[PDB]
């Protein structure tokens, strides 16, 4: 029950659980374009956007919220219309302009590079003035312009990646008030993404998990005007960490107290797995699904360390596809596979590590 | 028209065979039997060299007709069996507890990090030496030099066939092939014993439960054979069991079952010829195609969509955990094959998909 640990986990939770309107690809472009703070978008002579291929491929299939359009072009226009103070909720309240879209299309150049996360914007004005913007790395830090920080150090995340599973189990038993509100907002937000049926096999627990997870994932993908609660700057890791648990709870006890603790443990595990991991390819399901299998195991078996280690082991052995196909449906399919692996891991015991910590570290080593 | 019928029929008779135990123990038994020792009690030393990709998948596998698990009883079973039986070497053996204890004192196991390898070296109480070697794939007997029994240009022609060719073949099946398909259905249905992965009752959870149950029956070493496809019993289970379970859950059409099972076997052999493990990537492709034919008939647009979705939702490929890891991979294969029949998007068509999965399995094999 150390109070130093409680403040460290709280700061990391407040830093890694954030709202994002639209998928990372379009939202990141919109935020980077808004950071240039152009007063008159019609006074622009040239706009060059530099994106890495790893991320931003599949941006063509992503709906930009409040535009009724898909891809990079509407995301740039949306950024010119949005406010940088909104961060990844930049598309909120924007009034899409078809006039600005056609104006920008005949002025937009896209440069694609082969590198980790990168989103740079360079803009030439009709008066010679230049404006630059830059968001970099999977932690989405604004490099250009220099902004005031809520300020997690490298040593802080190093301390968190040395914590044990028991530390997260203790934390969920005495959750701060501010974190209870955050978890409840996460549950509400990600449950609101459930709309039309995407993959409904039956009425049982597993199919409700698959159907609700794939439905929330499709709602984001099509460009609906619903924010999502992302975990470690990934809206997919957010859905994967929360929706299989929200659906499991709906199919079982409908216990709001158990749901808060299981969702929180899942987010804590998802951040932990992300911090231990190195990026090169996807990981939404290997990290978010590990949070889900642990969170589901806590809902099902309580504070049982022998059960938790057995679910981590079975999940690591039944790990889904390394590479995601992308496109309009790829992520939804991987997330449905993640549901199956996380759910089925709660019924098989193996003999891939010897415990939760060794399992997360093993999945980290396979990222080569 | 009739040239294709004879080619397909010969390949069907050559690739659909009975197998008693799992490949790991059966391969050891066959390699030990290839030394053809007259008196097993006249042996001074036995060294078995195995690659790790098959050693780890053998430490808990039951050896048929022994009531024991692992490498030691498989070697003893090989000393008792006949090399003319190949993959059915453990058939009819009379296990000797005296020979087991005798051999345990003289047996050395060397483990190497390489593709499939199973070598046996034996020193006689008279100084004479006897060597055996199977490598790359079971039945590839390098030492001793043997005449080629089962049948490169025939497989090359079959590798160039279209999906339509298999759809035509299942509409006018020879009598000898209908008996083979019925024997395959009976044999693999007989492996279903105790429930392994329940999930209640649904078409999907029935497929999962029956597939994982048949796998567990083989894994524990029961003296009941399996119908293997391109050798490998796991590939036979994956190609047949999900279809047998789907048929039991929806209608009970024996005619549609025969055609769907046959198409699945035809696709499974095709995918194998167009090539590491791949039990689920090849057998599961046969299953999704066979299930799609049961569900939609001779519809090429549906079949193309089923292969595309399966290729995008492709399971693990690299199986860890152990022997239970195979049952988990086959349960994941059930989910991917079943769910692929409800989502439309990869290759673009069946042929491009089989060729694509083949290219990615090579990349996974180059990791180690
Ligand atoms: S990009 Fe991660 S699941 Fe698709
Ligand atoms: S060896 Fe093929 S699924 Fe395990
Ligand atoms: Cl096998």
Numbering used by the authors:
A (entry chain A): 1 to 149, 153 to 283, 286 to 356, 362 to 378
B (entry chain B): 2 to 152, 157 to 280, 286 to 355, 362 to 384
Quote the passages of the study that discuss this structure, keeping the authors' original sentences:
The function of such enzyme, L-cysteine desulfidase CyuA, which catalyzes L-cysteine decomposition to pyruvate, ammonia, and hydrogen sulfide, remains incompletely understood. Crystallographic and biochemical data reveal that MmCyuA binds a [4Fe-4S] cluster coordinated by three conserved cysteines; the fourth ligand is a nonconserved cysteine in the wild-type enzyme but is replaced by glycerol or ethylene glycol in a variant. Each monomer in the asymmetric unit was constituted by a N-terminal structural domain (residues 24–145), formed by a central antiparallel β-sheet surrounded by α-helices, and a mostly helical C-terminal structural domain (residues 157–378). We showed that, after anaerobic cluster reconstitution, MmCyuA can bind one [4Fe-4S] cluster per subunit, which was essential for cysteine desulfidase activity.
Attempts were made to co-crystallize holo-MmCyuA with the competitive inhibitor serine (10 mM). Crystals of holo-CyuA with MES were grown by mixing 1 µL of protein and 10 mM L-serine with 1 µL of a 500 µL reservoir solution containing 14% PEG 4000, 0.1 M MES pH 6.5, 0.1 M NaCl, 0.1 M MgCl2. The crystals, obtained also in space group P212121, diffracted at 2.4 Å resolution and possessed two molecules in the asymmetric unit (crystal 2), which differed by the orientation of the N-terminal domains relative to the catalytic domains. The structure was solved by single wavelength anomalous diffusion (SAD) using data collected near the Fe K-edge on Crystal 2. The anomalous maps from data recorded near the iron K-edge energy were best fitted with a [2Fe-2S] cluster bound to the four cysteines (Cys287, Cys289, Cys329 and Cys336), with an occupancy of 90%. In both molecules, the electron densities observed near the cluster did not fit with a serine molecule and were instead attributed to 2-(N-morpholino)ethanesulfonic acid (MES) in molecule A and to a chloride ion in molecule B, both present in the crystallization solution at a concentration of 100 mM. Thus, the structure corresponding to Crystal 2 was named [2Fe-2S]-CyuA + MES. The presence of two different ligands near the active sites of molecules A and B leads to slightly different positioning of the clusters. The sulfonate group of MES and the chloride ion were located at the same anion binding site occupied by the sulfate ion in the holo-MmCyuA structure. After freezing and storage in liquid nitrogen in sealed tubes, the [4Fe-4S] cluster displayed degradation, as shown by the poor activity and [Fe-S] content of the protein, as well as the [2Fe-2S] state of the cluster observed in Crystal 2.
